[PDB]
Amino acid sequence: TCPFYKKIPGTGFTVDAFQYGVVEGCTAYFLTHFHSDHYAGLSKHFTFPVYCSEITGNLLKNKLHVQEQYIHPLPLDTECIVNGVKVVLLDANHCPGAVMILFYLPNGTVILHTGDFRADPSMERSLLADQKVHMLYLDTTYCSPEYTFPSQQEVIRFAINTAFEAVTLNPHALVVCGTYSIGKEKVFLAIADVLGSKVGMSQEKYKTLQCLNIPEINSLITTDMCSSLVHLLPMMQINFKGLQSHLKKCGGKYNQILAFRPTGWTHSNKFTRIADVIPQTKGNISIYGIPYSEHSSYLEMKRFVQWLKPQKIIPTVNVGTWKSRSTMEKYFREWKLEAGY
Ligand code: NI
């Protein structure tokens, strides 16, 4: 059965609610983004209307086989009527195709559902500027002050400089980057660009990237591993064993691997600056964990919420323990007392 924080009151609508069977009274199922915890339950046998971005629609059709007649893509930054209710989709600054959803309810209430997002000051100049929000359904993944990490631009700067130095010292080094879902593609695209290479990958991953409307993609990626000196591998293989095994398959073209594991936050963020990050090394294999986040830091979340001044906040992450819920409610009250709303 569908929990309350996935229902939109006064509508026939649900958000990211595909794992509960037929939800009673649901006339339209919204999907914020193509991450498996959120799409859990969708397949080619789904027969209700799905509302989403163009990019999420390409992934539902090609990767999960959902039939076309049930896919309803909406443009961004555009007022749309769905089953008699005005809605707007906004870029969430998460993975490709990820949206926030503004709902203008028949009684005058306005609801923002962030999906998953990385709050940014540029959101203060979207269609959010114009009007009041009564309820905020908020991605609270990192809602605690210990959760700090750098900007995505600093992280990318570190990765490009590290890869360019290693391969210039040793032209026979291979670079490998881990992946397990969509998102974070800037990591491997920026590294391949500085190295003058396409990115090599499996047919399955190529198919997924082909759904993403990335400009000039055909010039950036390939399934011909032999032509490429940046390879993608599943995240599970980014360890000394998996990487040894990969280097054997490359036919003595390379004598060294430099690898990247994009994570979210890890406790080594509480001590070490991005500049000071060092790898794990065994022999001719080095593995860097880099903190590339597609979710708000605590500070970015607090700034967003203090700017929007919602009347009520409903968290959508970390909702399963009393201690988590109590912690998040304390911070919401500090934020409100500090800013005066
Ligand atoms: Ni996500």
Swiss-Prot record:
**What tissue specificity does the UniProt entry give?**
Expressed in brain, heart, kidney, liver, pancreas, placenta and skeletal muscle.
Annotated effect of mutating H295A: Impaired nuclear focus formation, reduced interaction with PIAS and increased sensitivity to cisplatin
What induces the gene encoding this protein? Answer: During mitosis. The mRNA encoding this protein contains an internal ribosome entry site (IRES) in its 5'-UTR. This 5'-UTR generally suppresses translation while specifically promoting expression during mitosis, when cap-dependent translation may be impaired.
**Where, subcellularly, is it found?**
Nucleus
Which proteins does it associate with, and in what oligomeric form?
Answer: Binds constitutively to TP53BP1. Binds CDC27, which is itself a component of the anaphase promoting complex (APC). Binds PIAS1.
Query: Per the similarity annotation, which family is this?
Result: Belongs to the DNA repair metallo-beta-lactamase (DRMBL) family.
Q: What does this protein do?
A: May be required for DNA interstrand cross-link repair. Also required for checkpoint mediated cell cycle arrest in early prophase in response to mitotic spindle poisons. Possesses beta-lactamase activity, catalyzing the hydrolysis of penicillin G and nitrocefin. Exhibits no activity towards other beta-lactam antibiotic classes including cephalosporins (cefotaxime) and carbapenems (imipenem).
What name goes with this protein?
DNA cross-link repair 1A protein
**Organism of derivation:** Homo sapiens (Human)
